[PDB]
Design a protein around this ligand. Structure first.
Ligand code: PRO
Ligand code: PRO
Lengths: 203, 202
């Protein structure tokens, strides 16, 4: 079971290998290139006002990078992209990709499908104004605990001792809701959680 | 002022009119369509825990519905779609649309642009801890104002009066951070903003 459409597309791309931690795309770069991840994983990241790194999302094999620029012709990169693992990345100009689409739209279907599957996950994960309020209070709770005397110093920030159940009691939501928000914050490079302890970054 | 490709796409569609509040796509519908709003607006809804109505998207003229199922045909989700206003919606089978894509990929491009903009909106929610707290305090401030006696009844919820500087001064953040948060809240379909006037939904 070969993939004729993919290898056709790939022959039109410049394929380069990036060691882990190397930067593929810099913030502010003119967006004129579409990327396809042949192998490996990347992190899409932005910075704080104090220059601390936050992860918008991870992109894996089969994902494209820079799809928005293909349609919106502004256009400067909003995010750095850095190799999470050693990766192989295919590169094509927007101009070349637009002519290929005309000839074989299956490759547009490929690009569209992987966006759609990424949209699906959050089709679920929603939350209203209340959930956003709860999120604020959880952050408040974590920030305040990291400031208190009984917080332990950690290479990545300040370590605090609190369960998800206790956060939920304070903030007025279920421990399941806390789990989801904590997992989100950990995915985003804002905290780490292990056992009953949480490391709040930057503090 | 002519869009021949759209006319071509629409000639392959069945166009239906829906009065406001009427359902377009029911819960658990096996996904095989592909909708295009010709006129008006719709709401995408889900029930939360216990069973209260919640908005996933407000979609307007030129927007697609059912575009995620195009790449996952047969999909059943718990969401449903309702007419916000009187609307006119073109529908087409995924099967037929796939035949059209080979001829002219332009409609798939418009659909994909919508999906790409949505991924970008989702990215703008991130999100440091201080930021998330400020966001919650801003939401809190708007929500409490909508509960006050001097709030006005609006079809979409409660209409309140407050400036961006007033919000910033109260909460303790820059005017730039207030703009960023209100925009985020509007993109999340939680409020609408028009000058001093803010409508808090629900
Ligand atoms: O379940 C509901 O609430 C909506 C009402 C119309 C059809 N589905
Ligand atoms: O160019 C195309 O592919 C179709 C033909 C008629 C309208 N647009």
């Amino acid at each position: 079971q070969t993939d004729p459409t993919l290898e056709w597309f790939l022959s039109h791309c410049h394929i380069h290998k990036y060691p882990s931690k190397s930067t593929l795309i810099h913030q502010g770069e003119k967006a004129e290139t579409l990327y396809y991840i042949v192998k490996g994983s990347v992190a899409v990241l932005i910075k704080d006002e104090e220059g601390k790194e936050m992860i918008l999302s991870y992109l894996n094999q089969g994902d494209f990078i820079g799809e928005l620029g293909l349609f919106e012709e502004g256009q400067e990169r909003s995010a750095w992209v850095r190799a999470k693992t050693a990766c192989e990345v295919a590169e094509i100009s927007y101009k070349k990709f637009r002519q290929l689409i005309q000839v074989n739209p299956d490759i547009l279907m490929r690009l569209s499908a992987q966006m759609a599957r990424r949209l699906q996950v959050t089709s679920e994960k929603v939350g209203n104004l209340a959930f956003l309020l709860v999120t604020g209070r959880i952050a408040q709770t974590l920030l305040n605990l990291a400031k208190q005397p009984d917080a332990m110093t950690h290479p990545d920030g300040m370590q605090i001792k609190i369960t998800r159940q206790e956060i939920g009691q304070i903030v007025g939501c279920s421990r399941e809701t806390v789990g989801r928000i904590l997992k989100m914050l950990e995915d985003q490079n804002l905290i780490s959680a292990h056992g009953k302890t949480i490391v709040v970054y930057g503090t």
